[PDB]
Amino acid sequence: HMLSDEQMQIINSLVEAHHKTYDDSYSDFVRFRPPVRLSMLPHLADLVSYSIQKVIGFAKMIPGFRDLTAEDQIALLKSSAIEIIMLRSNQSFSLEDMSWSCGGPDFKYCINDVTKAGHTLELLEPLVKFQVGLKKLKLHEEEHVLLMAICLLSPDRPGVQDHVRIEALQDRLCDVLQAYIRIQHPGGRLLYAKMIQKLADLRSLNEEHSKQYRSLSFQPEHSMQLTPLVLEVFGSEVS
Amino acid sequence: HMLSDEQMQIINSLVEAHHKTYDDSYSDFVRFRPPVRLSMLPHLADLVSYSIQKVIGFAKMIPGFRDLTAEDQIALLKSSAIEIIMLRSNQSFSLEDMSWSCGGPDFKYCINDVTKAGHTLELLEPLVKFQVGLKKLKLHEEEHVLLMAICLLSPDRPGVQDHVRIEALQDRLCDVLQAYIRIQHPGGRLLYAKMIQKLADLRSLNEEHSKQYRSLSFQPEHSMQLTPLVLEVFGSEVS
Amino acid sequence: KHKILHRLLQ
Amino acid sequence: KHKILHRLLQ
Ligand SMILES: CC(C)(O)CCC[C@H](CC#CC(O)(C(F)(F)F)C(F)(F)F)[C@H]1CC[C@H]2/C(=C/C=C3C[C@@H](O)C[C@H](O)C3)CCC[C@]12C
Ligand SMILES: CC(C)(O)CCC[C@H](CC#CC(O)(C(F)(F)F)C(F)(F)F)[C@H]1CC[C@H]2/C(=C/C=C3C[C@@H](O)C[C@H](O)C3)CCC[C@]12C
């Protein structure tokens, strides 16, 4: 009926990690190759590269992420990166105009903006549709942050060695998550499941991204516009 | 005493290739990651990547460059790229303020600008000193363009297979070069040699760039700021 | 080897 | 393998 000291240390830790790695001002966005509205590919690529960087920083600060092997950190990051990015982008997503809005109109990404980076306007449907549902759940910062750490710490990913110690870390986080809602979120008797459903939503979005990403990554005139980080994270090289 | 029709076709061809690949307005420079005055590394990296692209385009248009094997094209481009880039940058170099000036002050590269991309202010001396000498020679567009094609077509590079057919192409170009000066450049009885000396100057600058480039390319936090093209051209992978 | 140089050379 | 991820994980 009340969260325990350690469940609270965990929440505190994650919240800060996210403040420390999610720039509310989006001030770094002027250092990206500018948007031109595959004319958006250089900018989005930089946005995604940058975002991978934040995600990595966030992860390092998840309780017991660092005690994992380098190999598992990499395995978890590579497979979960795009999902974390999709999740975190929800903070900039806006229901009023169905667009991610990043502190200025040079940094407003609408659905046409995005077709201009090589994706089909209709394999983007699920992503928008997902941001809108996620948004509707009016997550607490605590829960948003918790969902991301739970995502990252999915042991059901290609390449993970210790899917027993990662299961442990995840379970602990779902424990925190589930209590938090119960104890601290009026009207959320049904939320945990809605969120968990979002984790499965993500898997599919992940799948879809990989298919399009494979398409671009195979045409050198496109791959050349990515960054070394993107190429490495989204690449199929194997530890 | 007068250049032959074919020597003139060659000159015409090179001049155009250079117009077709050297944007006098430098209008593409707004698509680079902006300069911040290793804070200049993202911008210069984009400048260099872009420049490699032009150089490649130029090369393709050199008489008989395309009839070479893919392998030799690559071998010639990889080893000569930085030299061509250094040469071509002379068009934007200014004696009045010892700086490359690219159509706007966001695009004025002075020597401090450059230390901020990871190089020593004193392994840059030779490069500035070289631009200044090159500038002093007040090359005709014809000769500037000819020197670049002669550079590219140096057969004394690592990896070149047919250093007999490339020697042929180069010789032919030096023939054109040498006649052009004789027939069309008053006061240039000594120039060809001064230029040829510049080709050897370049080799050393090349050497020096490789040493610094190796330094940056080995620290992932730096290599990550380069582009796929830069990494590939300047990389040591072997055909 | 040399994915992009190749492509840009076609 | 994974030059940069490794570096950013130290
Ligand atoms: C449906 C699907 C998966 O096909 C969409 C993919 C498009 C793209 C992801 C990508 C990619 C690439 O394949 C890359 F190569 F891998 F790069 C590229 F498209 F090819 F490039 C999506 C994912 C999340 C979206 C957005 C996030 C917004 C953010 C702003 C802010 O909230 C901070 C967030 O981290 C990030 C808005 C713009 C479009 C984004 C970045
Ligand atoms: C002395 C020496 C070799 O140590 C200088 C190297 C710095 C740098 C080249 C590089 C590099 C890198 O190692 C890269 F990684 F390989 F990228 C990087 F530094 F690490 F990035 C020099 C070479 C030519 C110079 C300039 C050219 C100007 C141009 C403008 C216009 O005239 C068009 C020209 O093509 C180009 C001005 C800015 C500084 C430049 C680009």
Experimental technique used to determine this entry: X-ray
**Residue B181 CB neighbour total at 10 angstroms:** 22
Q: Indicate the angle between helix axes B41-60 and B141-152, nearest 10 degrees.
A: 90
Q: DSSP secondary structure string, chain A?
A: ----HHHHHHHHHHHHHHHTT--TT-GGGGGSPPP---TTHHHHHHHHHHHHHHHHHHHHTSTTTTTS-HHHHHHHHHHHHHHHHHHHGGGTEETTTTEEE-SSGGGEE-HHHHHTTT--TTSSHHHHHHHHHHHHTT--HHHHHHHHHHHHT-S-STT-S-TTHHHHHHHHHHHHHHHHHHHH-TT-SSHHHHHHHHHHHHHHHHHHHHHHHHHHHTSHHHHTTS-HHHHHHSS----
Sorted by where each starts, the structural domains of chain B and their CATH numbers stand as 1-239 (1.10.565.10)
Non-local CB neighbours of B202 within 8 Å, separated by 6+ positions? B83, B86, B87, B130, B151
Q: Per the structure block, which two tokens stand in for B169?
A: 């192409």
Among D2, D6, D7, most B C-beta atoms within 10 A, so best to mutate, is D7
CB A46 within 8 A of CB B59: no
Residues of C in contact with B77 (CB under 8 A): 5
| Residue A8 identity | M
**Torsion sign over Cα A120, A123, A127, A128:** positive
Find tokens 């659905």 and name the residue. A111
Six-digit token string for A38: 């595959």
Chain A contact set for C7 (CB, 8 A):
219-221
Please answer yes or no on whether A232 and D8 come within 8 Å at the CB atom. no
Q: Which of C1, C3, C9 sits opposite B56 (nearest CB)?
A: C9
Residues 6+ apart with CB under 8 A from B160: B72, B75, B76, B166
- Atom number in ligand 2 closest to CA B206: 3
Q: Which of C3, C9, C10 to mutate to test the interface with B (most CBs of B within 10 A)?
A: C9
Question: Any known ligand binding at A51?
Answer: yes
Q: Hey, what's the torsion of the CAs at A98, A101, A107, A111, to 10 degrees? A: -10
DSSP state of B104: S
Which of A57, A73, A232 faces D4 most closely, judged by CB atoms?
Answer: A232
B135/B129 Cα distance (integer angstroms): 10
The CA distance from A227 to A39, in Å, is: 16
Helix-helix angle A5-19:A165-184, to 10 degrees: 100
Q: Are B173 and B10 in contact (CB under 8 A)?
A: yes
Residues whose CB falls within 8 Å of the CB of residue B237, separated by 6 or more in sequence, listed in order: C1, C2
Give me the amino acid identity at B165. Answer: R
Distance A107 CA to ligand 2 centre (A): 30
Phi-psi region of B187 (alpha: psi -120 to 50; beta: other; left: phi over 0): left
Tell me if A198 sits within 8 A of A148, measured CB to CB: no
DSSP bridge pairs for A108:
A101
- Asked whether A124 and A116 are in contact (CB, 8 A), the reply is no
Torsion sign (Cα): A116, A54, A21, A200: positive
Where chain A is discontinuous (C–N > 2.5 Å), the residues before each break are: 37
Using most ligand atoms within 8 A of CB, pick from B44, B51, B125 the residue to mutate for ligand 2.
B44
Kindly give the number of the ligand 2 atom that is closest to the alpha carbon of B91: 32
At residue B179, what is the residue type? Answer: A
Token output for B233:
């051209």
Kind plus residue range of the DSSP H or E element containing B109 = strand B108-109
> Can you point out the beta strands (E) in chain C?
none
Q: Which helix (H) or strand (E) holds B133?
A: helix B125-136
Contacts of A198 (CB under 8 A, 6+ apart): A130, A133, A134, A137, A147
Could you tell which of A37, A85, A107 is best to mutate to test the pocket of ligand 1, judged by most ligand atoms within 8 Å of the CB? A85
Q: Which residues of A touch B32 (CB under 8 A)?
A: 33
Whether C1 and B239 lie within 8 Å, measured CB to CB: yes
- Alpha-carbon torsion A173, A178, A180, A183, what sign? negative
- The letter for the amino acid at B124 is L
On whether B214 is known to bind a ligand per the annotation, the reply is: no
CB B214: neighbour CB atoms within 10 A? 11
CB within 8 Å: A223 and C3: yes
Cβ-based neighbours of A158, under 8 Å, separated by 6 or more = A75, A79
Residues of B in contact with C7 (CB under 8 A): none
Q: Is B100 helix (H, G, I), strand (E, B) or coil?
A: strand
Q: How far apart are CA B128 and CA B103, in angstroms?
A: 19
| Angstrom resolution of this structure | 2.5
